[PDB]
Every structure is written in C-alpha cells, then in structure tokens.
C-alpha cells in the first residue's frame, strides 16, 4: 500500500545528479590532492569533511564532485562485459 | 610689520603640523588596507584548480 510512496520518495533521491569518476595520482599536501578523471584531465582540488582516511590511497579510482570536484565516495570499478565470460561451463 | 608676518608664519607651521597626523594616520590605514589587499590576491582563486603544463 504505502510501498508505492516509498518508491516516489526514492525518485526524490533520483533528482541528485551523478558525480564524475577519477583516478588519483599522488598528493602535494593534505590540502592539495592530484586527481585525474578517466577522460584524462587532471585536477588539483580541495576535499570535503565527510570523507575518511581510506580515500587517500596510492592512486585508487575515486569519484569527483560535479562542482568542487571533491571526492565523496570511491567506487571500486565497473564492468559491462564480465558476465558474458562468467557463463562458460 | 615684522611681528605681523611673525604672527602669519606659524599658521602654515601649525598647518603642516596637523598635516603630520594627516598622512601618518592616513598611510597606516591604507597600509592595513594594503595588508587587507594581500588577503585579496591570496584569496583568489582558492579552490578548485586544474593542472597545466608550462611552455
């Protein structure tokens, strides 16, 4: 009954724009990190206060914000074709 | 006549005496305004930035 309105409230979360992934390189200081998007441009940007120490990493894939380009949460990877190689028997 | 100018000449004397605190108070303000201008140029651009290669 009320589960439909729950999906309607999920559409309000769908209004949020997706962020842009990137690959970190190294760090100049704690306030300056060098990240490189999959597209190839590099950005020295600041970071927000909600992240943790696991964000730093030695060049691990991260996602960049759409404005400050700060890293919110790092996604490990994504692969479309993998499932077609999973089914061999 | 010589006492006349003797009563005239201390005017610009005292007029430049108040011109001492004129500049000295003005220049220190502007100095603090120039130190405030140092925070300006250091504020720009803050974040974010993009990497580039010097030629």
């Amino acid at each position: 009954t009320k589960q439909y309105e729950k999906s309607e409230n999920d559409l309000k979360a769908l209004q949020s724009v997706g962020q842009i992934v990137g690959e970190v390189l190294k760090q100049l200081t704690e306030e300056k990190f060098i990240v490189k998007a999959t597209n190839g441009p590099r950005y020295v940007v600041g970071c927000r206060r909600q992240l943790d120490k696991s964000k730093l990493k030695p060049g691990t894939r991260v996602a960049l914000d759409m404005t400050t380009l700060t890293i919110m949460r790092y996604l490990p990877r994504e692969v479309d074709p993998l499932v077609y190689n999973m089914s061999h028997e | 006549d010589l006492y006349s100018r003797y009563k005239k000449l201390q005017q610009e004397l005292e007029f430049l005496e108040v011109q001492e605190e004129y500049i000295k108070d003005e220049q220190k303000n502007l100095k603090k305004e120039f130190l405030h201008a140092q925070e300006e140029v250091k504020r720009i651009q803050s974040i974010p930035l993009v990497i580039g290669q010097f030629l």
Side-chain angles (χ1 to χ4, degrees):
Chain A
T1 300
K2 295 176 178 178
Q3 299 179 336
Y4 295 96
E5 186 68 19
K6 177 182 177 182
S7 62
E8 298 301 319
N9 299 338
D10 296 341
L11 193 149
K12 303 295 185 295
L14 294 173
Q15 301 296 101
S16 177
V17 298
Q19 288 182 330
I20 175 64
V21 307
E23 286 83 356
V24 186
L25 307 184
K26 285 186 180 67
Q27 60 174 18
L28 199 153
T29 324
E30 299 299 325
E31 297 180 353
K32 295 179 179 179
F33 296 158
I34 302 187
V35 298
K36 178 175 68 180
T38 56
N39 305 129
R42 298 176 180 174
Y43 300 96
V44 275
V45 298
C47 288
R48 61 179 300 177
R49 301 177 181 87
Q50 81 171 22
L51 48 91
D52 294 335
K53 61 183 179 298
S54 301
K55 179 201 74 62
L56 307 181
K57 288 293 190 296
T60 302
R61 176 182 294 269
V62 298
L64 302 176
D65 191 14
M66 298 302 295
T67 305
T68 310
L69 310 174
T70 170
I71 297 96
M72 176 180 290
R73 287 177 291 104
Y74 57 95
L75 56 97
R77 265 151 298 184
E78 65 280 356
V79 51
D80 193 354
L82 174 60
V83 181
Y84 297 143
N85 306 127
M86 295 289 296
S87 300
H88 192 72
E89 80 290 358
Chain B
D1 191 13
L2 271 65
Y3 283 123
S4 296
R5 54 182 55 86
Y6 173 72
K7 296 301 181 180
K8 301 171 190 171
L9 292 180
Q10 77 283 4
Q11 270 67 359
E12 65 275 6
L13 193 152
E14 297 182 354
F15 293 168
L16 294 180
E17 180 178 359
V18 73
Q19 284 307 115
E20 298 301 324
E21 296 179 351
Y22 182 95
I23 164 183
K24 290 292 287 187
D25 191 14
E26 176 186 3
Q27 69 175 19
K28 293 186 67 63
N29 299 338
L30 176 60
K31 171 185 175 64
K32 297 180 291 291
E33 296 176 357
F34 182 80
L35 295 176
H36 180 280
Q38 292 299 324
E39 296 298 324
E40 294 296 327
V41 292
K42 294 303 293 181
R43 178 185 70 87
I44 285 93
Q45 58 276 356
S46 178
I47 50 96
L49 294 84
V50 59
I51 284 95
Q53 174 185 352
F54 191 86
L55 181 55

